[PDB]
Amino acid sequence: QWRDDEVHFNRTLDSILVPRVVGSRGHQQVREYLVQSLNGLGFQTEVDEFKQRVPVFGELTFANVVGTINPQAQNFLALACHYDSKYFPNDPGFVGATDSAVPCAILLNTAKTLGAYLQKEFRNRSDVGLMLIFFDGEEAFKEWTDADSVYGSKHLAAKLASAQLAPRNIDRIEVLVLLDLIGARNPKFSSFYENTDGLHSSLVQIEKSLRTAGQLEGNNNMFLSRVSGGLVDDDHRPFLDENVPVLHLVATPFPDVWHTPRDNAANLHWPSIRNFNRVFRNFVYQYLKRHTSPVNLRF
Ligand SMILES: *[C@@H]1O[C@H](CO)[C@@H](O[C@@H]2O[C@H](CO)[C@@H](O[C@@H]3O[C@H](CO)[C@@H](O)[C@H](O)[C@@H]3O)[C@H](O)[C@H]2NC(C)=O)[C@H](O)[C@H]1NC(C)=O
Numbered sequence: 432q433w434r435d436d437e438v439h440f441n442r443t444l445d446s447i448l449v450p451r452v453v454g455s456r457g458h459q460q461v462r463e464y465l466v467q468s469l470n471g472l473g474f475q476t477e478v479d480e481f482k483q484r485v486p487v488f489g490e491l492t493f494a495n496v497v498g499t500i501n502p503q504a505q506n507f508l509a510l511a512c513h514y515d516s517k518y519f520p521n522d523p524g525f526v527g528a529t530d531s532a533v534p535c536a537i538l539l540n541t542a543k544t545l546g547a548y549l550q551k552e553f554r555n556r557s558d559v560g561l562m563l564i565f566f567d568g569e570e571a572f573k574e575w576t577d578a579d580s581v582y583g584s585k586h587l588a589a590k591l592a593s594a595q596l597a598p599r600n601i602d603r604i605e606v607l608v609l610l611d612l613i614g615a616r617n618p619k620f621s622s623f624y625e626n627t628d629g630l631h632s633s634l635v636q637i638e639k640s641l642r643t644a645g646q647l648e649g650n651n652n653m654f655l656s657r658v659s660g661g662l663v664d665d666d667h668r669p670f671l672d673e674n675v676p677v678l679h680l681v682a683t684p685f686p687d688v689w690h691t692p693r694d695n696a697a698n699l700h701w702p703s704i705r706n707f708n709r710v711f712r713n714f715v716y717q718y719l720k721r722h723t724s725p726v727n728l729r730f
């Protein structure tokens with residue numbers, strides 16, 4: 432009973448899918464667009480803006496964009512992506528379609544498609560809220576290192592992590608669900624963390640339900656019942672370091688086009704996107720609808 436809204440999805444994606452390197456004018460437009468879109472979908476919207484030095488360009492202005500429904504709730508489901516496009520010396524026009532225009536558009540579209548719930552019955556409660564986090568400056572400028580990467584997430588985590596024996600705001604996040612590298616044909620998602628295996632399993636079972644009911648395109652399994660054997664550093668790392676459980680929805684293998692100019696709209700696979708959206712919007716709905724007591728995946 433949650434239907435597609437591909438018109439909204441396409442429109443949202445078209446607005447995000449422009450070059451948007453930190454420090455650029457195009458980046459500022461996308462930031463403003465994210466704030467406007469969140470306000471328009473019923474979120475209380477805040478920006479975490481700060482200056483920091485990066486290789487080559489020196490001091491730039493970063494801005495994490497955060498939307499919350501039920502800001503007073505005791506606990507939160509946090510869904511996230513990065514909205515910056517990577518700086519490339521040879522490719523100022525990189526649009527990062529899978530990385531992560533599509534992920535950010537998926538967050539907004541999930542809000543839209545579940546809007547009849549989120550903007551009404553979901554407001555009448557204090558146990559759980561919903562956060563959509565658009566991290567800035569995930570991408571390195573020179574080489575990915577512990578200094579040069581995840582600028583925005585590092586900052587937001589430190590902020591949420593900053594009376595003495597009370598819970599820090601970050602401890603109110605039951606799970607950070609981070610989407611990255613989505614939009615290529617036939618993505619495969621494996622479970623990176625034992626403590627969120629239960630949530631990964633729920634995506635597996637929701638996919639099986641939707642498939643069985645004839646609601647998915649094609650016969651490819653997207654959510655696998657397997658543990659990961661790789662390592663993927665990403666915006667979740669600063670949350671993991673503060674003991675926040677993580678579900679890391681990054682396709683492995685990476686899209687063929689990763690970090691090349693061909694990570695563009697022409698190389699997206701719309702059936703895969705639509706299938707991911709179907710599973711994901713139901714996962715989010717079920718998590719929130721079934722939430723009664725504080726969810727404990729830390730201890
Ligand atoms: C949202 O955006 C996507 C991407 O532009 C739209 O997907 C496109 O949808 C059209 C119409 O269904 C597809 O046209 C088809 O072309 C194939 C041959 O390539 C042909 O077999 C069909 O008869 C039809 O003409 C098109 O392939 C498809 N493009 C991609 C890249 O998937 C989609 O319709 C948009 N949805 C909206 C605006 O609701």
Ligand SMILES: [Zn+2]
Binds near residue numbers: 570690
């Ligand atoms: Zn990237």
